[PDB]
Design an enzyme around this catalytic site. Structure first.
Site, short mmCIF file in Angstrom:
data_model
loop_
_atom_site.label_atom_id
_atom_site.label_comp_id
_atom_site.label_asym_id
_atom_site.label_seq_id
_atom_site.Cartn_x
_atom_site.Cartn_y
_atom_site.Cartn_z
N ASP A 1 33.74 44.27 35.28
CA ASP A 1 34.22 44.47 35.18
C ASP A 1 35.10 44.35 34.21
OD1 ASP A 1 33.82 46.49 37.36
OD2 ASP A 1 35.00 45.03 38.73
N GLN A 2 35.71 43.04 34.10
CA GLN A 2 36.26 42.41 33.00
C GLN A 2 35.45 42.83 31.53
OE1 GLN A 2 35.12 39.99 30.65
NE2 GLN A 2 37.13 38.86 29.96
N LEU A 56 38.12 41.65 40.49
CA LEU A 56 37.84 42.28 39.31
C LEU A 56 36.94 41.36 39.90
CD1 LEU A 56 39.96 43.35 36.91
CD2 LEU A 56 38.79 44.84 38.60
N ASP A 57 34.85 41.83 39.48
CA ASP A 57 34.46 40.90 38.68
C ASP A 57 34.30 40.75 37.44
OD1 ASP A 57 32.77 43.54 38.27
OD2 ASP A 57 31.69 42.90 39.94
N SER A 58 33.23 40.30 36.33
CA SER A 58 32.97 40.09 35.36
C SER A 58 31.97 40.89 34.21
CB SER A 58 32.80 38.58 35.08
OG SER A 58 30.71 39.13 35.28
#
Ligand SMILES: CCCCCCCCCCCCCCCCCC(=O)OC[C@H](COP(=O)([O-])OCC(O)COP(=O)([O-])OC[C@@H](COC(=O)CCCCCCCCCCCCCCCCC)OC(=O)CCCCCCCCCCCCCCCCC)OC(=O)CCCCCCCCCCCCCCCCC
Ligand SMILES: CCCCCCCCCCCCCCCCCC(=O)OC[C@H](COP(=O)([O-])OCC[N+](C)(C)C)OC(=O)CCCCCCCCCCCCCCCCC
Ligand SMILES: CCCCCCCCCCCCCCCCCC(=O)OC[C@H](COP(=O)([O-])OCC[N+](C)(C)C)OC(=O)CCCCCCCCCCCCCCCCC
Ligand SMILES: CCCCCCCCCCCCCCCCCC(=O)OC[C@H](COP(=O)(O)OCCN)OC(=O)CCCCCCCCCCCCCCCCC
Ligand SMILES: CCCCCCCCCCCCCCCCCC(=O)OC[C@H](COP(=O)(O)OCCN)OC(=O)CCCCCCCCCCCCCCCCC
Ligand SMILES: CCCCCCCCCCCCCCCCCC(=O)OC[C@H](COP(=O)(O)OCCN)OC(=O)CCCCCCCCCCCCCCCCC
Ligand SMILES: CCCCCCCCCCC[C@H](O)CC(=O)SCCNC(=O)CCNC(=O)[C@H](O)C(C)(C)COP(=O)(O)O
Ligand SMILES: CCCCCCCCCCCCCC(=O)O
Lengths: 127, 86, 12, 172, 110, 166, 62, 122, 459, 81, 128, 71
Positions: B44-45, B40-42
């Site tokens: 998504d976080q 994921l990327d941030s």
């Protein structure tokens, strides 16, 4: 980017210490230890009678509670208030002054005995 | 109101994650890094953090949320905030 | 589960 | 010290999504407009130079201020919520337990034995953690409010007492 | 007003307690069936508030509107009280529509 | 004399008894909220008889029981106006606060100072009854300001919260 | 930056931004969490007027 | 109502003034004008303790209703004919007030008519 | 009055001849006994005054003040013995001697039948008061406070001395009864205008009048707790009592001479109530609130109505009790945190619950919540002022609003909110402190049952 | 207790407004990846709610039946007179 | 764009609307770092005393004492009679006094004129 | 949990209900509707009014005292 190794380590150490502190807040079965007390005869009859708490005993326990409450909170205060008003407050003029009752035609006055005359014949409006 | 255990927090944290289409349920682990392991990327976080906030009914501040790169860190954070020791 | 509640001294 | 560009973009993403949620209310409508908002954020995800990326951020912030919900949803226990700081009147500090009368304490022997154990822990570990703070803080003093873990076996993280022994969120 | 206003506040408190001190109607929803008695009470209370005939609010509020329409009154005050009479039905609708109708919007732990 | 006066007064006096008892022994136990709710229900039941007498014949009276002071030509006394407004509002308010106290026994069940909360509710009720039955402006002001301060103390019930105090 | 020397008795006391305490960060760990104050840091001249019980200068939507 | 529009956004001199009417003598165009009759005497209204604003020309029905309400306690449902008699008398009184308003208006319009015709020739 | 004066004088030999550790016990016991005796002075007559001898008399104005003084002495003793625990035996006996001397001077001041004797006794109160402030105060600012208090009072008082001896030379007597019965109207001339100013300014600066009040914050703040208690409770009332006595020779000059003072006090009550909203020192806030209530007393005395005088008497009594209570409550926190800064120790209700209750009672009485005698006095003065001019209701309503605001603000900031994290020395309230507050508050509320005892001779 | 959560395998956006949202988004190229997180809000006993008029009319059928019985009973009482 | 938000004294400019947050120079970065360092030094100094097991009392705060001294005792040592201070003192000290004197004197002269001609009714004013 | 677990909480599901709450809600909604219907049957006048509103324009000038314009 996330915790550093130092932050992660310190957080887990503080987490362990905090969890030990929170577990330590739990009470033991003996805790709290109560000091001795005395039981009055009025409530001494209830740990021998209401020790079972039967439905027929629950009704009589509520009856005793409600009768004691009624006399001590209603009957004694109403006794004192009625005595106060009947023999002290109304021993002075104009203390309790009551708006006089409305009097209608036809009415019979209790005190004198007179009968109020009936109104004159209505002009007879018909719906 | 019922109390909160460590296992309940872990179960619900994994539950929310398994309903995210970008995560593989058969590859999801409590130690799976959202960036590295799951790819994921941030953003998504950020969405994962908001899902956790909606799930548990409370807010995680952005200074603290940006460090929760793993499901286990999420359950640790919730346990610390909710005073659950189990 | 019962926890110890921290309160100030009520004795005095 | 400061927030990086990535951090600010993420904060705005979260805040705009929450205000969108406050406007939309229903979950399907929020899902639809949230995916549209994420598309907006993904449009310039890979921007070459940061000058126009920062200009995009400025325009987005002006738009957010214009279109924000006057009363967004607030979590009840979060700042500005209806249950925010409702439980401060019950958070008695742990030093009040020392001023208890000896007859109050005798009702809790096991707890106060555990408390003496914790107090002995705190008293014993204090000197070797002031030491570690001295040995770790560079000349000129600390530059960040961060604190170190314990680095050797037997030691406790410095300045741990009031973090570890803080009042519970639902104390009384 | 005492009866149905106090009862409406207790209905609100029932919802708030059941939803873990949540008080936003945006996080309410679907409580028509999940809280049947709270729902019946709130609906009856809002009908009494909006002057539904032969409920408690009908024997004062309806006569009040009748008297204000029939009096030598400030015209603007008459218009404003009529418009506010529309708006009370409007906000009762808001309460019912967001708290009870629709779908659950509260956290999953029911 | 006429039961109307004694009953109208007794409805007010019974409210204050759990306040005097708020330092005896029951105020330290978990029976205090039910106790005060019960006296409120009993006060409601008592207040119906003055309401019924007014309903029948319109019995109304003013009672000036206790003389407080005279200021040259102005006599200030404890005077209660037991008119239509008083004898109709008292049962309604008592019914409503009966329901509220029963509700609070569930809603505020987990409050560590629930006994003090119920005591504050009774204090507000007493001050409002003073406000409503007052036959002179000083007594009405007493009710007015006691109502105000009870509202202050109950709005800032959670006093660790800045917004509540504000 | 001190207040201007206009004969009002401010002396050398720093003139801090006229920002209410409600505008401070609520998610930071203040030494005084309620006042949102840190130990040793300069106190605004108008602290007792800008406390959260009092005058708020917070930015508004409109 | 339409009278408000006729008076405000029109000619108010053709419309009655609610504060000042009637401004025509009650015997103008009303020969054998009969004075309203009172049934209830002032004393009867006094000891019935009627509210002063309740002491209107229909107050005898009010007194009958009050007496029957007192004599029907606790049957608060009975004494319903009396309430209707009082209500119908009040309704007739209100139609009388409407009649007075309309007579005022039809005399004001006719006043304007008469002066206008007189001024037409000279 | 000798059955009151002589027992008080006997406190000194008893104090100096008692054991080192029986000092407080003996002084407290026998000062309470003297206060019991002083209550018999409240048996007053409708028309005449209690004229015991040629040199002392008592009426409904001075009897409540005498009771207040005799009551204040034991409470003083309970408040002092904490901060003076480390002092030497001789120095404790000297402090007790100062307090006894002050009480004796006040007792004779309120009963002196002659104006010059009243002047000497009212001036004598300076000496033990100044000694207390400057010797047993805590800060370096006590010296300047002592100088301010001394010289403000003396600059007021000396012209009064000149006026009194002139009046004795022209009228032949300074006897209060003779002065009343042989009252001459005061003509409109510069001579009489300055005689009025001389007769009034000493009591003006004593109350104090707004604009002449700058000594009071210094003195009431820097003084030790017993000194603050007396200064707020009985010493301010010397100006009001003296003004009530001496206004019987100032008519009809008071009709227009009071306008500057009426304006000063009516606006300065607003000004000093507003100052309380921003005071960062708790003791200073409590000191500043005395100025507003005393401004109300000033207005009441200056408009010269029976209702105004009744209200002024009741307000003086109620303010004495309430201000002393507030000073004691602040001192209990000061003795724990060793500071008067108000936002230093916050959230104290979750550490000292019954002390928080005492704080709430004190704030409520300072609020003038009905039916307290504070409210009775304030309301009577407000009604008399409304008769004097309807426009007075704007300023007095503003003042009661601001008074509510600052009283409840002090309550909220000290008692409510979150406790201070680093203050870990808030020990539980001692029986002595709780008893001090209880003995402040209980007689205040009991007076509501018999309000005529403090309504003065015009009741 | 233990509070065993239900199997997550059952949550599907099919048949809900979430599927309508997904169809709308896919026409634009986007895709909602949190749809199954909301699916419980449209399923089970929450998968059917009344309208506003229907909510207001709770108990109307039984109230009307009781009213009809009461009206007929009063007609019979009048016939007894 | 969109309608601009105008900051005010009582409704200030939000940080996200402030242009300075978007033009950050390296010296601004160094200033922020120095501010963080000062704040960290103060925080460390406070936390060392705070967490000390053998400290009892209040952690004396020099900032608090400076604040309370500046607001009380430093004001007259640093006051100067200037046109601003003198104008303000005359306006706020003397202005309201004469304003209220004029208002009350006018009201009472009107009242007394009414009384002299008996134009003021006091039918039931026997309490004064 | 603890004592009083009559209604066991559920995760992501419709809550457990009891017969008494449903029956009481149904009964009281039915009671309100019956009261409205019964009162409307017996007191239509409280909603529709009791007496006809007169029409002023229909009143004859002789019943109103308006003489012809030549008197
Ligand atoms: C018909 C017209 C009206 C006629 C009558 C008029 C009467 C007054 C009406 C107007 C009143 C308006 C304001 C009402 C109160 C508002 C604030 C409030 O609720 O505070 C609660 C609070 C105590 O309760 P709390 O906060 O739960 O206690 C917490 C403790 O930490 C822990 O407490 P605890 O759990 O350990 O239990 C112990 C507690 C037990 O007490 C209580 O729990 C509360 C008792 C309340 C009594 C009723 C209210 C006060 C009424 C009189 C004032 O006691 C204490 O804590 C110590 C108190 C010692 C002094 C008490 C007051 C004087 C004696 C009693 C007077 C009655 O404070 C008070 O009760 C003091 C109120 C002072 C009001 C200001 C003065 C106004 C003028 C009064 C004149 C009275 C003249 C006649 C009586 C003379 C007696 C000598
Ligand atoms: C209240 C509930 C009812 C109580 C019983 C009914 C009677 C009643 O209330 O009587 C009240 C009575 C007056 O009301 P009463 O007139 O009804 O009294 C009845 C008795 N007869 C008929 C003989 C008059 O007042 C008091 O008891 C209050 C006394 C107030 C004064 C107390 C002085 C104490 C001094 C201690 C030292 C502190 C001094 C501080 C400074 C003071 C300056 C003056
Ligand atoms: C008695 C009658 C005497 C008549 C004969 C004497 C007349 C001349 C008096 C000259 C006094 C000079 C005072 C000092 C000076 O000039 O400035 C000092 C000061 C200025 O000194 P400064 O500038 O050093 O002040 C410094 C302040 N701190 C310490 C905070 C830094 O003057 C003023 O501030 C204003 C002076 C005039 C104000 C009005 C005073 C009289 C008000 C009426 C009184 C009642 C009638
Ligand atoms: C202006 C309006 C506002 C007023 C505000 C007042 C604020 C203060 C607080 C008031 C609280 C309630 C006060 C009233 C309670 C009863 C008081 C009382 O009975 O007082 C004794 C009374 C004295 O005689 P009385 O003529 O009433 O008064 C004289 C002047 N004070 O005695 C009598 O008259 C005789 C009493 C006989 C009682 C017999 C029964 C005793 C009790 C039972 C047995 C024990
Ligand atoms: C040192 C700094 C300056 C101090 C102030 C100035 C004091 C002297 C200024 C003149 C005062 C006025 C005066 O002289 O009044 C005289 C007046 C009449 O008495 P006599 O002179 O006998 O005349 C009778 C009629 N043929 O006398 C009387 O009527 C009796 C007055 C006796 C007391 C006078 C005191 C001075 C005047 C009052 C000052 C203001 C009040 C105090 C303020 C603080 C000072
Ligand atoms: C820091 C200061 C501290 C305090 C210092 C001491 C107190 C202040 C000064 C006290 C001395 C004031 C002396 C006033 C003497 C007035 C003599 C006089 O002539 O009085 C009569 C006059 C009548 O006016 P007339 O229009 O005739 O009435 C209607 C019928 N024709 O009526 C009048 O003249 C009435 C009075 C008018 C003048 C004053 C009005 C009040 C204005 C505010 C004054 C505030 C004090 C400070 C002023 C500083 C400048
Ligand atoms: C009321 C409703 C709301 C009303 C208001 C709604 C406002 C919506 C505005 C949407 C458009 C707006 O331009 C978005 C902006 O601010 S764009 C700034 C530059 N953006 C970049 O992408 C360039 C640099 N790139 C990165 O920083 C990383 O690529 C990233 C963090 C994105 C992902 O990386 P990952 O975190 O590692
Ligand atoms: C069908 C009703 C719609 C709303 C009507 C609003 C106005 C009602 C009052 C009209 C004016 C009354 C006074 C005259 O006529």
């Amino acid at each position: 980017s996330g915790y550093t190794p130092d932050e992660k380590l310190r957080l887990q150490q503080l987490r362990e210490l905090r969890r030990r502190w929170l577990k330590d807040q739990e009470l033991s079965p003996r805790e709290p230890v109560l000091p001795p007390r005395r039981v009055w005869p009025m409530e001494q009859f209830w740990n021998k009678f209401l020790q079972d708490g039967a439905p027929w005993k629950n009704v009589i326990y509520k009856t005793y509670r409600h009768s004691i409450f009624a006399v001590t909170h209603v009957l004694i205060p109403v006794w004192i208030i009625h005595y106060y008003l009947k023999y002290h407050v109304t021993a002075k003029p104009y203390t309790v002054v009551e708006r006089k009752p409305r009097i209608f035609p036809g009415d019979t006055i209790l005190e004198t005995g007179e009968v109020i005359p009936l109104m004159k014949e209505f002009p007879d409006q018909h719906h | 109101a019922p109390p909160l255990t460590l296992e309940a927090i872990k179960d619900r944290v994994l539950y929310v994650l398994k309903l995210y289409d970008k995560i593989d349920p058969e590859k999801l682990s409590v130690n799976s890094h959202f960036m590295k392991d799951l790819g994921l990327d941030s953003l998504d976080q950020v969405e994962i953090i908001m899902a956790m906030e909606d799930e548990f009914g409370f807010e995680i501040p952005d200074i603290d949320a940006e460090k929760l790169m793993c499901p286990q860190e999420i359950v640790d954070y919730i346990a610390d905030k909710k005073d659950v020791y189990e | 589960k019962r926890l110890f509640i921290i309160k100030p001294s009520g004795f005095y | 010290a400061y927030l990086t560009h990535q951090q600010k973009v993420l904060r705005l993403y979260k805040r705009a999504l929450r205000h969108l949620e406050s406007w939309c209310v229903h979950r399907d409508k929020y899902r639809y407009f949230a995916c549209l908002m994420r598309a907006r954020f993904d449009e310039h995800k890979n921007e070459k130079d940061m000058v126009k990326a920062t200009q995009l951020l400025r325009q987005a912030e002006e738009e957010f201020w214009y279109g924000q919900h006057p009363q967004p949803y607030i979590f009840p226990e979060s700042p500005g919520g209806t249950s925010y700081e409702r439980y401060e009147c019950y958070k008695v500090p742990e030093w009040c337990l020392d001023d208890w009368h000896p007859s109050e304490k005798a009702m809790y022997p096991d707890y106060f034995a555990k408390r003496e154990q914790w107090k002995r822990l705190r008293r014993e570990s204090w000197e070797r953690e002031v030491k570690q703070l001295q040995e770790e803080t560079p000349p000129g003093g600390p530059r960040t409010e961060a604190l170190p873990p314990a680095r050797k076996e037997g030691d406790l993280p410095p300045l741990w007492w009031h973090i570890v022994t803080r009042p519970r969120e639902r104390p009384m | 007003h005492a009866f149905f206003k106090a009862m409406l506040f207790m209905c609100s408190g029932s919802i708030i307690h059941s939803l873990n001190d949540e008080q936003d109607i945006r996080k309410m929803g679907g409580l028509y069936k999940a809280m049947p008695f709270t729902t019946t009470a709130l609906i009856i209370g809002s009908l009494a508030l909006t002057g539904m005939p032969y409920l408690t609010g009908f024997y004062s509020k309806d006569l009040i509107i009748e008297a204000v329409n029939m009096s030598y009154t400030n015209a603007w005050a008459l218009l404003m009280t009529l418009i506010a009479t529309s708006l009370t039905a409007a906000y009762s609708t808001r309460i019912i529509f967001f708290a009870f109708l629709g779908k659950p919007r509260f956290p999953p732990l029911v | 004399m006429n039961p109307f006066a004694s009953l109208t007064l007794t409805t007010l006096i019974i409210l204050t008894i759990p306040i005097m008892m708020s330092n005896s022994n029951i105020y330290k136990t978990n029976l205090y909220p039910n106790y005060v709710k019960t006296t409120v229900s009993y006060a409601f039941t008592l207040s119906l008889v003055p309401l019924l007498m007014f309903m029948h014949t319109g019995q109304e009276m003013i009672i000036s029981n206790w003389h407080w002071m005279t200021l040259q030509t102005v006599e200030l006394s404890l005077s209660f106006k037991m008119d239509y407004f008083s004898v109709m509002f008292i049962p309604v308010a008592l019914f409503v606060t009966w329901s509220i106290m029963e509700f609070s026994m569930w809603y505020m069940h987990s409050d560590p100072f629930i006994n003090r909360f119920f005591k504050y509710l009774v204090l507000f009720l007493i001050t409002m009854m003073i406000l409503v039955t007052a036959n002179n402006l000083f007594q009405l002001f007493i009710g007015w300001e006691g109502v105000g301060i009870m509202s202050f103390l109950l709005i800032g019930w959670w006093h660790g919260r800045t917004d509540a105090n504000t | 930056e001190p207040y201007p020397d206009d004969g009002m008795g401010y002396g050398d006391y720093p003139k801090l931004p006229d920002r209410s305490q409600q505008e401070r960060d609520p998610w930071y760990d203040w030494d005084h969490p309620d006042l949102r104050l840190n130990w040793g840091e300069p106190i605004h001249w108008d602290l007792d007027m800008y406390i959260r019980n009092r005058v708020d200068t917070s930015p508004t939507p409109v | 109502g339409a009278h408000l529009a006729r008076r405000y956004l029109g000619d108010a001199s053709k419309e009655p003034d609610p504060l000042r009417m009637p401004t025509f003598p009650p015997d103008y165009g009303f020969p054998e004008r009969k004075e309203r009759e009172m049934v209830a005497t002032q004393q009867e209204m006094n000891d019935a303790q009627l509210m002063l604003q309740q002491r209107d020309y229909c107050a005898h029905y009010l007194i009958q209703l009050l007496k029957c309400k007192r004599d029907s306690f606790p049957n608060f449902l009975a004494c319903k004919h009396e309430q209707h008699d009082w209500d119908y008398c009040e309704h007739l009184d209100y139609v009388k007030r409407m009649k007075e308003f309309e007579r005022e208006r039809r005399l004001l319009q006719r006043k304007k008519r008469r002066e206008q015709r007189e001024a037409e020739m000279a | 009055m000798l059955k009151i004066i002589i027992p008080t004088t006997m406190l000194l030999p008893m104090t100096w001849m008692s054991k080192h550790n029986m000092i407080w016990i003996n002084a407290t016991v026998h000062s309470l006994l003297i206060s019991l005796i002083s209550l018999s002075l409240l048996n007053q007559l409708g028309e005449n005054s209690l004229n015991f001898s040629l040199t002392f008399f008592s009426d409904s104005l001075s009897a409540p003040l005498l009771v207040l003084t005799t009551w204040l002495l034991p409470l003083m003793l309970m408040a002092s013995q904490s901060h003076l625990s480390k002092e030497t035996t001789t120095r404790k006996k000297l402090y007790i001697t100062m307090l006894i001397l002050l009480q004796l001077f006040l007792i004779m001041t309120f009963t002196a039948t002659e104006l010059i004797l009243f002047y000497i006794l009212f001036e004598a109160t300076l000496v033990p008061t100044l000694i207390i402030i400057t010797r047993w105060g805590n800060q370096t600012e006590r010296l300047n406070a002592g100088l301010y208090f001394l010289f403000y009072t003396l600059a007021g008082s000396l012209p009064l001395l000149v006026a009194l001896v002139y009046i004795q030379n022209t009228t032949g007597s300074l006897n209060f009864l003779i002065i009343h019965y042989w009252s001459h109207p005061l003509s409109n001339s510069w001579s009489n205008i300055f005689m009025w100013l001389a007769c009034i300014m000493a009591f003006m600066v004593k109350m104090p009048l707004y604009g002449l009040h700058l000594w009071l914050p210094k003195a009431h703040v820097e003084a030790p707790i017993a000194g603050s208690m007396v200064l707020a409770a009985v010493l301010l009332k010397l100006g009001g009592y003296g003004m009530m006595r001496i206004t019987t020779i100032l008519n009809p000059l008071t009709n227009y001479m009071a306008y500057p003072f009426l304006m000063l006090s009516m606006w300065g009550m607003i000004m000093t109530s507003s100052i309380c909203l921003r005071q960062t020192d708790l003791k200073s806030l409590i000191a500043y609130s005395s100025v507003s209530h005393m401004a109300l007393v000033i207005v009441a005395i200056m408009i010269q109505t029976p209702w105004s005088f009744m209200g002024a008497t009741a307000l003086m009594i109620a303010h004495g009790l309430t201000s002393s209570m507030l000073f004691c409550l602040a001192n209990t926190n000061y003795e724990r945190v060793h500071s008067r800064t108000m936002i230093l120790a916050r959230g104290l209700q979750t550490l000292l619950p019954l002390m928080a209750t005492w704080w709430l009672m004190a704030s409520l009485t300072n609020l003038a919540l009905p039916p307290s005698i504070n409210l009775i006095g304030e309301l009577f003065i407000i009604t008399a002022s409304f008769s004097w001019s309807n426009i007075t209701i704007i300023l007095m309503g503003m003042n009661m609003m601001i008074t509510a605001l600052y009283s409840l603000y002090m309550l909220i900031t000290t008692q409510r909110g979150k406790y201070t994290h680093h203050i870990n020395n808030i020990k539980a309230s001692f029986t002595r402190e709780n008893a001090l507050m209880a003995l402040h508050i209980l007689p205040l509320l009991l007076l509501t049952l018999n309000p005529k005892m403090i309504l003065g001779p015009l009741y | 207790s233990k509070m065993e959560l239900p199997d997550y395998k059952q949550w599907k956006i099919e048949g809900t407004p979430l599927e309508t949202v997904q169809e709308k988004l896919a026409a634009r190229g986007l895709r909602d990846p949190w749809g199954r997180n909301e699916a419980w809000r449209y399923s089970g006993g929450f998968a059917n709610n009344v309208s506003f008029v229907g909510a207001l009319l709770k108990g109307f059928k039984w109230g009307f039946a009781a009213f009809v019985v009461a009206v007929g009973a009063e007609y019979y009482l009048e016939s007894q007179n | 764009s969109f309608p601009k938000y105008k900051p005010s004294r009582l409704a200030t400019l939000p940080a996200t609307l402030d242009p300075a947050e978007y033009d950050i120079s390296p010296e601004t970065r160094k200033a922020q770092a120095e501010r963080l360092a000062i704040r960290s030094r103060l925080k460390r100094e406070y936390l060392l005393q705070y967490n000390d097991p053998n400290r009892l009392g209040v952690i004396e705060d020099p900032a608090l004492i400076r604040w309370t001294y500046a607001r009380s005792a430093n004001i007259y040592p640093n006051f100067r009679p200037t046109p601003k201070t003198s104008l303000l003192g005359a306006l706020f000290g003397i202005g309201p006094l004469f304003f209220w004197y004029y208002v009350f004197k006018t009201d009472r002269d009107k009242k007394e004129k009414l009384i002299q001609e008996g134009k003021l009714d006091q039918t039931f004013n026997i309490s004064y | 949990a603890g004592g009083g677990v009559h209604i066991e909480p559920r995760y992501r599901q419709f809550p457990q209900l009891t017969r008494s709450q449903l029956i009481q809600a149904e009964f009281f909604s039915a009671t309100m509707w019956f009261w409205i219907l019964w009162r409307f049957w017996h007191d239509s006048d409280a909603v529709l009014g009791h007496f006809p509103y007169p029409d002023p324009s229909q009143w004859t000038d002789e019943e109103l005292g308006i003489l012809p314009d030549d008197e």
